[PDB]
């Protein structure tokens, strides 16, 4: 029945979509800025591939989640 | 929705920051060729 169910809540409170965007977007930007710097000041021999892949992964993770929350704050509702 | 005053303030502040970064670039490059 529709009487034994509960009203559906969103997994994230809507009124915290903005505050959770910037925090998940600033950090991301920061990490990306750490990646870019690392690729300008490094010679071919000195570059380690594991640090490149790891910082790429973390920056992409936080940037992707931040882009989602930004996309959802403006009113697209993916 | 953004108003006109908010976006005008944003454009002004962004232009000022742009020209500050221009002068900072000139300072850095001249001081350390």
């Amino acid at each position: 029945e529709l009487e034994a169910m509960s009203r559906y809540t969103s997994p994230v409170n809507p009124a915290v979509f903005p505050h959770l965007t910037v925090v998940l977007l600033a950090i991301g930007m920061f990490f990306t800025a750490w990646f870019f710097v690392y690729e300008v000041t490094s010679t071919k021999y000195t570059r380690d591939i594991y640090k490149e892949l790891l910082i790429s992964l973390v920056a992409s993770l936080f940037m992707g989640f931040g882009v989602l929350f930004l996309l959802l704050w403006v009113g697209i509702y993916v | 929705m953004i108003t006109d005053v908010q976006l005008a303030i944003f454009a002004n502040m962004l232009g000022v920051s742009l020209f500050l970064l221009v002068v900072l670039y000139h300072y850095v490059a001249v001081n350390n060729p």
Binding site: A33 | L18, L21
Partner: peptide, 30 residues
Amino acid sequence: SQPAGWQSLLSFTILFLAWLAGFSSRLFAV
């Protein structure tokens, strides 16, 4: 911290902010 890396980072940042100022000053009719 080589000044060349920071110099290029500063150049990239100032070009991106020029892009954003050019895109943001053209929305007074939208």
